[PDB]
Amino acid sequence: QTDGIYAAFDTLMSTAGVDSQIAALAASEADAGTLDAALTQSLQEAQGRWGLGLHHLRHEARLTDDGDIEILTDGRPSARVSEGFGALAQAYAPMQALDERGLSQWAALGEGYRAPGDLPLAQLKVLIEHARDFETDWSAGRGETFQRVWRKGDTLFVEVARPASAEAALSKAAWKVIASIKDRAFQRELMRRSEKDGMLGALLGARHAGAKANLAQLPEAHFTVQAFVQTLSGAAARNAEEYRAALKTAAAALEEYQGVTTRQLSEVLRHGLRES
Amino acid sequence: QTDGIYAAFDTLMSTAGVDSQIAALAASEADAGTLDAALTQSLQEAQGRWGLGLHHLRHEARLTDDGDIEILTDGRPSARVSEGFGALAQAYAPMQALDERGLSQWAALGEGYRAPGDLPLAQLKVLIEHARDFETDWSAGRGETFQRVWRKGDTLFVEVARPASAEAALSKAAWKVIASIKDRAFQRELMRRSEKDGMLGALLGARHAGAKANLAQLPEAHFTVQAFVQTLSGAAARNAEEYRAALKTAAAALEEYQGVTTRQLSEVLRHGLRES
Q1: A182 at interface of B, judged by CB pairs closer than 8 A
Q2: Residues A40, A45, A46, A47, Cα dihedral to 10°
C-alpha cells in the first residue's frame, strides 16, 4: 500500500519522461525533507512538460500523514496520489485556459505586457541581450510545433510544445501499432473494424474484457508529454546563440520524448492483441 | 563512374546509420591502405548492424584493378558494388540461417558450448566475471526485441536485434505514410488496395510509372537496420553493471536508429523517385 503509492507516483512522473526514482529513494531511507524536495523538483520538471500552462502556480509535493503523497498548487493541497491520476487531472483542469489549438493562453509572469504572437529574430535578440524581464506568446514553428520564451529574474525559460490530447497520443500509437501485426488476415479484420470504430475503438476489440477500464486504469489515459522546457542562466540567459542552441537541443528533445511516449503506448496497447 | 561507386557505398552504409565518408576520403588523396581500412571498418559496422547473423565471418572490402570495389567474405569475392545491391543481397543469402523469428541461428564463436536462452542473470554475471570465452543464445527482450552476448578474448559483445526484413520495413514505412494522409477517401481507398496489392505497392500506385523500379534500385530495397552491437573491452568486459548499462545503451540505440530509418523512409516514399 505504501510501496503502491511510490510506484504510482513513479508512473505519474513517467508520463513526463521523468525518471523520478522516488520509490528507490524512499527505500534508501533518507531524511523526510530531502524526499520532499525531490518530489517537488521532479513534479515541477514534469509540470514543465505535461503542457498544462501552470507556470504561474508553485507546485509542491510532500508526504502525508498516513503514507500518501500530497500534490499542491500555490500552497493549496490540490490532490493525493491515492485518489487516482484522473482525480489529479480533474483538479488541474480548472486552472487551464487552453485555446482551440491546444496551446495555453495563461501567462507565466502573470499580469503585465506580453509580446505579440511572434517577433523577428532581430528584435528578439535585443530583448534577450538588453531587457530585464519579459514573456512572449506562442509563435508558429517548424513541424506543427509552437514555441515561447520568458525570463524570470536571472533564469530564462524556453518552452516548445506540440499539443496532443491523451486520446490523440493513444490514437497515434495504435495507428502505428496496427501496421506491424504479423498476420495478414487478422490485420484485414482490424482494418475492416477501423472504418466504423476509429483506431481506438477498433483496437479495443482484441484487448480483454473491460479494455477501456484496462487502459483508463493507466496514467496515460489522462496524461502524456506535450512540451519540453529548457532553462538557461547567467550569460547564457543573455546570448542569442545559446538561446538558439537550447531551442534545437530542446526541440529535438521534445520530438524524442513524444516518440518515446508513443512507443510506450504502442507497447501497452500491443499487450493482449495478437492472441485475439 | 568512379564517383558513383563511392556514392553508392556511402548510401549503402547509410542504410545502417554508418556515415562512411569514403567518397570524401578518396577525394582527399588517401592511400589505398587507408581506403581499404576505412572500407572494412565501415562494412563491419554495417554488418553488425544489419543483423544478418554473419559475425562468424571476417568481411573485407577493397579496390580492384579496374577501379571498382570488391567485397570479400573470408577472402571469397561475393560481389562488386557496380553489380548492384540486390546482387549483394542474393550473394549474402546462402550463408544465412535465419529461423522463424528472423534471428541468426549461427554461432558467433564457432563450434563450442552455448549458454541457454533463459540463463538466469545470477549465473550470467558469474559468466561475465570469471569465464574466459562464452556465448549465449538469443533470449527475448521487451517489445519483441531479442538480445545475446558473448566474449572473445578481451572483447565483450552485446547484440540487440528486432527482426525486420527490408521489405517489411518498407511496408511499415508505407503504413506510416498513408497514416499521415489527410483526405479520408484517399486513405480508405489506399487501405482497400493494400489488402490485395500489398501496402508498399498500393502507395507506389500513386507516383511516376517508374516508382517500383526506381525504388528497387535504392539501397533500402534490400537492407534495413535489424540489430545493434555494443562492444566493451578491458575490465569493463568483466563488470555486471557495465553489462547492464551496455544492454540498455544498445536497446536505446536500436530504437533510435530504427525510428530514424522509419521516418526517412516515410518521407522518401512520400516524395520518392525524383530521378532527374
Answers
A1: no
A2: 80
